[PDB]
Amino acid sequence: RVQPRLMLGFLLILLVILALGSANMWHIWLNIRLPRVLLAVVVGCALAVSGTIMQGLFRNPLADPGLLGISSGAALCVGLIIVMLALYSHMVGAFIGSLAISTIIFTLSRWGHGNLARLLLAGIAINALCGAAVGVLTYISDDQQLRQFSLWSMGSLGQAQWSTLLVASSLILPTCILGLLQARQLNLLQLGDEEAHYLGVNVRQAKLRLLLLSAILIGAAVAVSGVIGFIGLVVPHLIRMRIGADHRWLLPGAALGGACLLLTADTLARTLVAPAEMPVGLLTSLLGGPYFLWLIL
């Protein structure tokens, strides 16, 4: 174990070192690299925190945004808003999809006997569904929209601008604070719904507010970044293996570790090969995959 304040401090100076350091890797530095580095930070924070709230709510070590298939739902809602305030149509669309699939997965984790299996299977089904639907459309209709969207749903921050980053951060930064105020209920909810109800916890309210919370989070993160699925799985386990599972230290620790890890993954994405902007998600899926298989084993 390690002191929480030390871990937070270390993750914070690490975030700073990583941001400044990735800034070396003129309307380029100010209007492209700065807001892309900052977007990696804000989205990484979104997925980290969301993955942590999610894992809390479902009482599951494996409840990620893009593994229960909430991300895929949000993205597919983005696509349904493009086939037919614009950034707000993306926000509200991806938030609709996010909240919808999130509400399905929530329903299934509560009413059935608590099984990580089932949830992750619903994940596989939904992911396969959307992943199929996109490529199908790539074979059906042809225009710049669908190719750009197919590369974008792969999870990329190649299209980082100041207005997107602004709206995204205006939805994300207060929701990550709202996640932090709820860290008490999140702890007590770990005991079980009934158990927490006996302690005074209004379990329904806490469940809703958490669902909502992570829905807004994933909505924003996805509608600006696409689909990334390990920044909600891995970072909370990483922080939690060095702090108590207490959510007061868990949430913020993840928020900083997520910004760290995504940024390391994005900065490495656009640099790992000579002028080749490969989507972040290829890198997260690649690294996080066989890591996750290692956890099982």
Partner: protein
């Protein structure tokens, strides 16, 4: 200090899982809900505990309906222990018990935890992953959580409910817990209400016993007023008979060859 229950009904799709049931658990008394499978003991427990809303009946605690009771104060007065543990994250035993101090705004959590953990035999378990604990250790830690929730510096009436025991939990640990709660009943003003499947444990460690069958209360009274061969044959399928305890002045239930 009375927990009163007036004509509790609980239906699931027109099927009266708990039919007409009236009862009362008094401070400083150890009551036992018993019965065969399907009787709805858990449903009755969850009715008395305020978790499940009654259909037609009412359920008062300290002269005030559980409906009008506020979550905080209720959390102070009544606590519930279940034995299944649903922790998928590394909380230390201390964190888990301290979690019991929820209704009390951080006031004397250290004192309460010290006493409680001392008397349920933890302490050497305090800095340990809750998931790694064996069955009995889990028993003691959960018992500690509930006693911590029910710790106050004053002599005040409180209710501890004890849901049906998990199955891998030996006789030793059931016995130990029931003994502890039993004597607590004599010392402080505490009312225990446990749900046991084992008739002998109910005979030994309960002051009153409540035989629930088909959503109805079919027996209320002392271990001797209830656990007789006639009523046992009547409601239980095993070939059980009633003899006398060689050591105690209580009924004993035995299996015929």
């Amino acid at each position: 200090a009375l927990l009163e229950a007036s004509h509790l009904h609980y239906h699931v799709q027109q099927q009266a899982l708990i039919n007409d049931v009236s009862l009362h658990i008094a401070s400083g008394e150890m009551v036992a809900i018993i019965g065969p499978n399907g009787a709805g003991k858990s449903t009755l427990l969850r009715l008395l505990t305020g978790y499940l809303s009654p259909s037609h009946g009412e359920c008062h605690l300290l002269g005030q309906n559980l409906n009008s009771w506020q979550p905080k104060a209720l959390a102070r007065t009544r606590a519930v222990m279940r034995q299944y543990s649903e922790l998928a994250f590394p909380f230390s035993v201390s964190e888990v018990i301290q979690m019991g101090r929820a209704p009390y705004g951080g006031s004397q959590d250290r004192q309460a935890l010290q006493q409680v953990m001392a008397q349920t035999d933890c302490l050497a378990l305090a800095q340990r992953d809750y998931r790694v604990l064996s069955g009995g250790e889990q028993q003691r830690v959960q018992l500690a959580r509930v006693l911590a929730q029910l710790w106050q510096p004053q002599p005040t009436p409180r209710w501890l409910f004890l849901d049906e025991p998990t199955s891998a939990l030996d006789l030793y640990h059931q016995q130990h817990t029931l003994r502890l709660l039993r004597q607590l009943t004599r010392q402080e003003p505490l009312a225990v209400c446990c749900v046991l499947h084992d008739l002998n444990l109910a005979a030994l460690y309960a002051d009153r016993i409540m035989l629930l069958a088909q959503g109805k209360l079919v027996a209320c009274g002392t271990p001797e007023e209830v656990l007789n061969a006639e009523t046992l044959t009547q409601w239980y399928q095993a070939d059980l008979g009633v003899s006398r305890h060689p050591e105690s002045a209580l009924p004993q239930i035995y299996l015929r060859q």
